[PDB]
């Protein structure tokens, strides 16, 4: 059984994009050491990302600069993974008829999202939920 709805955004795959946070304007960043955060510096080399669809509505989110996969670990922390594993799949969904959200597939029952705070730090999975501004993204082509 699905734990979530199936409203999908138009897909934007195999082309470099930025994940823009509607909660403060940071872009999602995967640094070379595997840590994840946000920055408003549009020229940063580590905010360029590429999404690919695994199944309909399931994506990987990959750093174009470093090849790392975004992933969420067992305690809810985002990290950069050298190889694709079960922690790297996200359910890409439309939200409020406009934004994109990314739910951890591994933890989908628990409603753990990719989230960016106004101060540029990312949220731990269990501190996210439907209704939060931190979970809302726009995918901007580069």
Which H helix or E strand runs over 71?
strand 69-72
Question: In Å, what is the CA distance from 140 to each residue of 16, 48, 56, 60, 118?
Answer: 9, 10, 20, 16, 19
Range of the domain at 28: 1-142
In angstroms, what is the resolution? 1.6
Q: What is the domain-level CATH number for residue 81?
A: 2.80.10.50
Split into its structural domains, the chain has a count of 1
24 by Cβ neighbours in 10 Å (0-12 / 13-18 / 19+) ranks as middle
Q: How was this structure determined?
A: X-ray
Annotated binding residues for heparin, as ranges? 23
Location of structure tokens 């990302």: 49
Annotated binding residues, as ranges? 23
- Tell me the sheet residues that pair with 63: 49
């Amino acid at each position: 059984h699905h734990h979530h709805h199936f409203n999908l955004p138009p897909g934007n795959y195999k082309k470099p994009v930025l994940l823009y946070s509607s909660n403060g304007g940071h872009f999602l960043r995967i640094l070379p050491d595997g840590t994840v955060d946000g920055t408003r510096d549009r020229s940063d080399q580590h905010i360029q990302l590429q999404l690919s669809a695994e199944s309909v509505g399931e994506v990987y989110i990959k750093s174009t600069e470093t090849g790392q996969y975004l992933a969420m670990d067992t305690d809810g922390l985002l990290y950069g993974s050298q190889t694709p594993n079960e922690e790297c799949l996200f359910l890409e969904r439309l939200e409020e008829n406009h934004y994109n959200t990314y739910i951890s597939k591994k933890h989908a029952e628990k409603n753990w999202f990719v989230g960016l705070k106004k101060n540029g730090s990312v949220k731990r999975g269990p501190r996210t939920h439907y209704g939060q501004k931190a979970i809302l993204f726009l995918v901007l082509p580069v």
